[PDB]
Design a binder for these strands. Structure first.
Lengths: 88, 78, 96, 98
DNA sequence: TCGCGAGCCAGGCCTGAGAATCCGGTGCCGAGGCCGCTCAATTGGTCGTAGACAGCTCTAGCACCGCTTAAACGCACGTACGCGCTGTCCCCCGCGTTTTAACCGCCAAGGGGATTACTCCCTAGTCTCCAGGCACGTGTCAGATATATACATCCAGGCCTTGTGTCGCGAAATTC
DNA sequence: GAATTTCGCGACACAAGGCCTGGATGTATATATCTGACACGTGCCTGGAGACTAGGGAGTAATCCCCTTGGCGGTTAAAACGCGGGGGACAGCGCGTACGTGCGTTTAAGCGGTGCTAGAGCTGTCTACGACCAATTGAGCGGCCTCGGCACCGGATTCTCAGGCCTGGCTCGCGA
């Protein structure tokens, strides 16, 4: 159901975790998002919040920003939504 | 006046049929079904009556309206 | 207090109603329903009393048969409670 | 590596094919022999016009097709896809044939 | 793993509360009988014809034969789905209390159903005419059949990605 | 403080899911051929059509009365509502066996031709049989009465669902 990295990220406040710690984001995608400018987890969190938690818009932006596919975007969106539900 | 078919009345009708447990949406469905069937009987009864130049829908007209649709009714004949 | 588990009162009612034969719809609500439905085809119709009696007997028998078939459908699907989908299937198979 | 459809697709191809055509689906001679066999139970030495046997076969096929449509509705009602003898018996019992 | 304390659940004994049934009594109104009538069934005769019977024609239903191949049959194999089971939850059911309008008897009015008489025009019946449509023969093009071709589709293989496990080696703890 | 060794890091590797790409397959599509079934022309003859008549069926008014609608006052039985709860609906998961899939083999269905004769079909005769009408009378329908089978009511007696309590075995858990 849920990856272990997802559980580790959702368990505790993100604080200063690097963007590569996000569920569904590997080294390549993390590097790409850093190159675009998004170098921290909370930056992606804020970008998610700006889109008012819309699943389709978040996944489409992620896809157009680094080339993530359905599974990676789904995992990242689920992790971020659960983090918001647990801390936000 | 279709709400005149009271929910306990439909419950009793089901009890006669051998039903044991009744859902909740059933009541509106039964009212709809009863409305349709009553329309389809009274239409033919009224047509028979309009034919004979009467203003009273006698019993034989209702018996014939049923007899057309295959549900022969005994006891009112007539 | 003393209170039956649900299901037994249903069986007592089942036997009581399958033993007797009186009408199961109160007469006056049904009479007003019949007049309301006929009011759209002819305006000044007066029903003989026995005509309304026959209409009511036919409606009760039709509904009892319908609930018999619906109960067969419901028991078919490993349930005990009928549902609108059961009635819709019974009417669909019957030819309506 | 071999071509082998998943169980389910060949059924749909056959369904489309047999719902698009109109020819008779029971071989003629077995049915004719069955009809004569049944008829011999009532009065012996009867002769059948060929058109009569054809009409009988058309009626039987249409009846079975209708029966299977209603049986399939009953089976889907029980949240299955297989039709079973209890499905056929229920369809007939509701239709009033038994 | 056993001894032993303690509690949880399975099943039977027993009872109680409520329902179904059996018994008796009263009364009541509907079924069964009796009389008057009247008209529908009966009987007898006549007569027109529906169809029973005999006979001939000729069509198609039956039986048979042989050949070809479409389809049924048997077998093996894979997988997917029907059945069993469990856990969840919610929503009909059982009951008590309140409300309400169905039911019953009575009234009265008159709308219209049913009956009868008179009238007239609509239709069955017959005759005479004639052409609309049926049976037959003859032509031609719509669809059957084939052929190849182009393309949509199903399903498998290939490559990218993330996630994860793991072991030699860095970083730190421990003893001499 | 040094050597060594255990825990954690990065390279190495692997596994699962998704996206890209292609072949085999079936379906759609265009082009050609051909043949038999539909469309058309024609003779005739039987059924449709026009005229005219007689009479009976239906229309329409007049009239009676019955029974349907409306309304009212009491009285309840029954509907309406709410709430606690427990059992049923529903989703989910696992399995194994049973049904779909495909391939080689047999088999018998289907197509063709022939032979024939039993029986469908059509026609001719004429006799038994059913319509029709007049007279008649007794079977059956309308109305009145009565009395007893049954509805109704009360009151016992047995039956049935439920549960509470006790007995019994089972299980859980800590230490030797």
């Amino acid at each position: 159901t849920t990856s272990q990295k997802h559980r580790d990220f959702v368990a505790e406040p993100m604080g200063e975790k690097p963007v590569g710690s996000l569920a569904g984001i590997g080294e390549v995608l993390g590097k790409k998002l850093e190159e675009r400018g998004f170098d921290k987890a909370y930056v992606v969190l804020g970008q998610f919040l700006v889109l008012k938690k819309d699943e389709d818009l978040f996944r489409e932006w992620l896809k157009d920003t680094c080339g993530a596919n359905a599974k990676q975007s789904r995992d990242c969106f689920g992790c971020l939504r659960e983090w918001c539900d647990a801390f936000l | 006046n279709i709400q005149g078919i009271t929910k306990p009345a439909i419950r009793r009708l089901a009890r006669r049929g051998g039903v044991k447990r009744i859902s909740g949406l059933i009541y509106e469905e039964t009212r709809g079904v009863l409305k349709v069937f009553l329309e389809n009987v009274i239409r033919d009864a009224v047509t028979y009556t309009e034919h004979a130049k009467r203003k009273t829908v006698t019993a034989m007209d209702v018996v014939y309206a049923l007899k057309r649709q295959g549900r022969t009714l005994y006891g009112f004949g007539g | 207090p003393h209170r039956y588990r649900p299901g037994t009162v249903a069986l007592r009612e089942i036997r009581r109603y399958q033993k007797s034969t009186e009408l199961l719809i109160r007469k006056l609500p049904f009479q007003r329903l019949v007049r309301e439905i006929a009011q759209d085809f002819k305006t000044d119709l007066r029903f003989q009393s026995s005509a309304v009696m026959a209409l009511q007997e036919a409606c009760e028998a039709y509904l009892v048969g319908l609930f018999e078939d619906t109960n067969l459908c419901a028991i078919h699907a490993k349930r005990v409670t009928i549902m609108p989908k059961d009635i819709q299937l019974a009417r669909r198979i019957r030819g309506e």
